Design an enzyme around this catalytic site. Sequence first.
Site, PDB file in Angstrom:
ATOM      1  N   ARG A   3       1.012  -1.578   0.164  1.00  0.00           N
ATOM      2  CA  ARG A   3       0.266   0.039  -0.076  1.00  0.00           C
ATOM      3  C   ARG A   3       0.720   1.210  -0.059  1.00  0.00           C
ATOM      4  O   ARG A   3       0.424   2.096   0.019  1.00  0.00           O
ATOM      5  CB  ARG A   3      -0.961   0.041   1.219  1.00  0.00           C
ATOM      6  N   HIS A 100     -11.317   0.414   4.282  1.00  0.00           N
ATOM      7  CA  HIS A 100     -10.460  -1.398   4.980  1.00  0.00           C
ATOM      8  C   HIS A 100     -10.696  -1.757   3.527  1.00  0.00           C
ATOM      9  O   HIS A 100     -11.796  -1.884   2.684  1.00  0.00           O
ATOM     10  CB  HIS A 100     -11.349  -1.603   5.641  1.00  0.00           C
ATOM     11  N   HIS A 101      -9.328  -2.928   3.213  1.00  0.00           N
ATOM     12  CA  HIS A 101      -9.595  -3.433   2.323  1.00  0.00           C
ATOM     13  C   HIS A 101     -11.031  -4.623   2.009  1.00  0.00           C
ATOM     14  O   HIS A 101      -9.719  -5.579   3.081  1.00  0.00           O
ATOM     15  CB  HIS A 101      -8.219  -3.535   1.606  1.00  0.00           C
ATOM     16  N   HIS A 129     -10.696  -7.511  11.985  1.00  0.00           N
ATOM     17  CA  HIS A 129      -9.100  -7.614  12.078  1.00  0.00           C
ATOM     18  C   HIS A 129      -9.334  -9.098  13.289  1.00  0.00           C
ATOM     19  O   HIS A 129      -8.548  -9.116  14.490  1.00  0.00           O
ATOM     20  CB  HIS A 129      -8.552  -7.178  12.508  1.00  0.00           C
TER      21      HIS A 129
END
Length: 132
Positions: A3, A100-101, A129
Site C-alpha cells: 500500500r 478497509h480493504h 481483524h
Amino acid sequence: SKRNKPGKATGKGKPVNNKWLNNAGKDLGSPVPDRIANKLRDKEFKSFQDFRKKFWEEVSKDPELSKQFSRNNNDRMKVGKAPKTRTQDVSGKRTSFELHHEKPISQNGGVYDMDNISVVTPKRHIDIHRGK
DNA sequence: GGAATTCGATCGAATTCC
DNA sequence: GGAATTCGATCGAATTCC
C-alpha cells in the site's frame, strides 16, 4: 510493502444514500460512492496514502455527500484528512473513519480497487481483524 | 506459569525535504 | 505543492523474562 508502492485507481463504485456512512459500523461498512468512483477512476496514485487524501478530498467536492457532514468535518476532507466518526464509534485515540480493504492486501488485495475499498469506524474496523 | 515487551497486519496524521 | 519519511495507534498471536 504494498500500500506504499504506486498504483492505478480502478472500480465501479456503488449508488449511495443521503445517509452514507450511517452504516459504516456494520459488517463491512459503507461502499465507495459510484459518483466518487467515477472521479478517481483512471487516476495515478503514488501510495494508498495518496489515494486516501484524494478520496476524502473528492467527497468534499461532492454536493450530495459533503452536505451530510458537519462544517467541521468538511474542512478536514478538503485537505485530505478523514471525517471524525461519532464518539460511540471510536476506538481509543483512533477517531477518524477508516478505509478497509475487503480482501486483505497481505492476501493479494486490490490496493486501489475501489470495489474492494470500504469506509468503516475504528470500533468496527477492529472487530473485523478478529472475526467478530 | 504467568506477567511483560515484541511483532507484525492494519490504520491515519504530522514532519521533513526538495 | 507534492512526495517520501516518520510518528502514533489498537489488537491478537508470539516471543522474551523471571
